[PDB]
Amino acid sequence: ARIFHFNSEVLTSPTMESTLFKAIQWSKKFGGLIFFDLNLPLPLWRSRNETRKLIKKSWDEANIIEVSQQELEFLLDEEYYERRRNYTPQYFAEDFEQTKNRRDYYHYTPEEIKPLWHDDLKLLVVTDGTLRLHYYTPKFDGVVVGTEDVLITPFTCDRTGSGDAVVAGIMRKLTTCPEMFEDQDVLERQLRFAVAAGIISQWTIGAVRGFPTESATQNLKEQVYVPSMW
Amino acid sequence: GEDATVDKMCLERFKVFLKQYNEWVEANKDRLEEDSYKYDQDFYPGRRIRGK
Helix, strand or coil, X not given: CCEEEEEHHHHHCHHHHHHHHHHHHHHXXXXXXXXEECCCCHHHHCXXXXXXXXXXXXXXXXXXXXXXXXXHHHHHCHHHHHHHHHCCCCCCCCCHHHHCCCCCCCCCCHHXXXXXXXXXCCEEEEEECCCEEXXXXXXXXXXXXXXXXXXXXXXXXXXXXXXXXXXXXXXXXXXXXXXXXXXXXXXXXXXXXXXXXXXXXXXXXXXXXXXXXXXXXXXXXXXXCCHHXX | CHHHCHHHCCCHHHHXXXXXXXXXXXXXXXXXXXXXXXXCCCCCCXXXXXXX
């Protein structure tokens, strides 16, 4: 295996914790990459500090990390970002685009990500559903603009398994495109594939039942984006 | 000229006002800034000039 993938659910079991760390040592010995897809279960949302202490070791043992926007904001500070989202200027906006009252797509600075950064981290992806894919690397950072349409099929739409599709698309492009870790344009182009995979996965009832194929995902990626973005 | 130098000024009442004003300013300077930050979310001309 070239990528080793696991979730934070195993951290709720001591036996699986020890087995996971042994498996991580084995995989790192043979040259594999560690993919930490957090997916915080119900117990791990109780408070920030206990979860940080619980996940610190696995966080530092990972080369690739995927967190949701809610997971990242919980891990750093929920109240601060909630206050920042709710802020409205009293008299006038600082620029015109702030007058439209658009949905907030705030891109966290690497300075804010600094507490969660470590030396072996090659890529961190923050996902606001399929709408935004904030990526951070030791050299650069940015955001991939995506979309979603579950109202196109109101009677078959189901969001279960969408993040699994996004993570699977990320791994699929990472295993075949090593230049993703070093090229920003290539990274965005390949992350649009995962965005499309997540979009299709929302159109079917059931996670396993609605997982897209590569052909359909590439077709949707080419349909949604302009040809210069492929 | 030298007959209008500040030492020849007769402003003793104004000097008492100045010393009392300076005492009040030193005593109340920070509380006014805190109140301005608490009550006025954003700065506008006419508001208290605060911060940097």
